[PDB]
Amino acid sequence: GPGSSRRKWNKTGHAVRAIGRLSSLENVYIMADKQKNGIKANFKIRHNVEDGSVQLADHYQQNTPIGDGPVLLPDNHYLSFQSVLSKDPNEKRDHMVLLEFVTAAGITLGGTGSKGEELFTGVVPILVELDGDVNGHKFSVSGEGEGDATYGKLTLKLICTTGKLPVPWPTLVTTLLKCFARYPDHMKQHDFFKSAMPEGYVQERTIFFKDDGNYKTRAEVKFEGDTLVNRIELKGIGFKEDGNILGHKLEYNTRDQLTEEQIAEFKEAFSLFDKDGDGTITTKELGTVMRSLGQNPTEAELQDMINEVDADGNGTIDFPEFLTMMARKMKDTDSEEEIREAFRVFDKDGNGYISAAELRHVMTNLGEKLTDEEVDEMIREADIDGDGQVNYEEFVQMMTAK
Ligand SMILES: [Ca+2]
Ligand SMILES: [Ca+2]
Ligand SMILES: [Ca+2]
Ligand SMILES: [Ca+2]
């Protein structure tokens, strides 16, 4: 057809790109399996390959309740995942520290929920145990951590007890606790996972690695004492002894990635908004901090603000949502300006220096509490050139664990 033969090349390779852009489903969709009194999920994971490529893992997931209870069968919706992989420098073994932030979304909105859901209310210790055989290569993984459903948080430390792990850690991530997802109140009756809980659910998967082998897994996620347990049997077949997986061509982490430390800071900051520590930030709660700083956003101005970062459009922001809005990277001239603007909030009289009382007003309006000696000591920490107060330079080189 008509158009520049340049126009046509590009238009063809915009729609091919487009297809791959639409095909990259980041979310994890949940459907019901009422006949199986359960749920399923079919999703893909893109594992970065060392040489720029990508190894994708086609996941096919089935879930069922172990017990005979009532269970909540959910409508179509999705989980939303943010994973952070790291190492403990103390730990000497082949291992992984894994942090997940899982939030539920997908639905536009007495009360109820599940009994089984009152068990996630606070922090739950986690035990994970995995038994696999990949292409004959046998290994065991073990680990502990905790789950904090309110901030959709999961933290684990996973050891390979049998010594060297014969597959890359990334590939085991999905396998080694969706009951730690934050289901927003407005859909807390689509949380199959907690509902099935105390007796628990089976989570079976087949993961197809493109041009490489497959993993089969069957796991029981149930309570033992008050430890939430994830116990797995993993069987892998079809894998070339030198594909990305068995040859370890897969990479651990990206590199622009949030440290465990940073995420902790973002949690503490989230708490500053979440006055009632109920895991969400409301228009009310946002207003309170805003006014406290000295602004007057209207009910509507707040609702907008939130609705612009509130994935599940329920009017509140939960920690993964917050964590997401903080995890966006910017054109570092926007980031720079963000810092310039943060500075001007701290530097209240706008004289270009943050004083001790200026630092105190900000932390105080933020709902922190502070001894004069802590204030004076913070200023000590930032006051490089030692003039008793903090300029823009000092603020920048003090603000950078972004
Ligand atoms: Ca709250
Ligand atoms: Ca929300
Ligand atoms: Ca000042
Ligand atoms: Ca200074």
Of 258, 276, 297, the residue at which a domain comes to its end is 258
- If phi > 0 it is left, if psi is from -120 to 50 it is alpha, else beta; for residue 217 that is beta
Looking at the fold, whether 218 and 325 belong to one and the same domain comes out as: no
CA 357–ligand 3 middle distance (angstroms) = 9
Which conformational region is residue 313 in: left (phi greater than 0), alpha (psi within -120 to 50 degrees), or beta?
left
Same domain (yes/no): 266, 161: no
Residues 35 and 177 both lie in one domain: yes
**156 CA → ligand 1 middle, Å:** 26
Is residue 311 located within the same domain as residue 375? yes
| b/e 282-312 (16+ beta carbons within 10 angstroms → b) | bbebbbbbbeeeeeeeeeeebbebbeeebbb
Residue finishing a domain among 258, 284, 305: 258
Q: How many whole angstroms from 289 Cα to the centroid of ligand 1?
A: 12
Alpha-carbon distance values, 85 to 33, 173, 211, 287, 367 (Å): 32, 9, 25, 35, 32
**Structural domains counted in the chain:** 2
Resolution in A: 2.6
- Nearest to residue 70, comparing CAs of 112, 107, 105? 112
Is residue 214 domain-shared with residue 308, that is, in the same domain? Answer: no
Residues 399 and 372 in one domain: yes
Between the CA of 294 and the centroid of ligand 1 the distance, in Å, is 21
Nearest-angstrom CA–CA distance, 324 and 384:
32
108 and 163 co-located in one domain: yes
Q: Which ligand is nearest to the CA of 345?
A: 3
Number of H helices, E strands in the chain: 10, 13
Mention every residue, 6+ apart, whose C-beta is less than 8 A from residue 296. 290
Instruction: Clarify whether residues 212 and 266 are in a common domain.
Output: no
Q: Is 191 labeled as ligand-binding?
A: no
| CA atoms of 345 and 340, how far apart (whole Å) | 9
DSSP of 303-342? HHHHHTT-TT-SS-EEHHHHHHHHH----HHHHHHHHHHH
131 annotated among ligand-binding-site residues? no
385 is in an annotated binding site: yes
Final residue of a domain: which of 258, 289, 311?
258
Tokens of 226: 């008050």
CATH of the domain at 182: 2.40.155.10
Domain carrying residue 399: 259-402
Question: Cα 53 vs. chain centroid, distance in angstroms?
Answer: 24
Considering the domain architecture, whether residues 242 and 206 belong to the same structural domain is answered as yes
Largest Cα span, the chain? 75
257 contacts 87 by C-beta, under 8 angstroms: no
| Shared-domain flag, residues 243 and 325 | no
80/91 same-domain check: yes
Experimental method: X-ray
Here the CATH number for the domain that contains residue 268 is 1.10.238.10
Q: 206 with 218, same domain? A: yes
CB 114 within 8 A of CB 191: yes
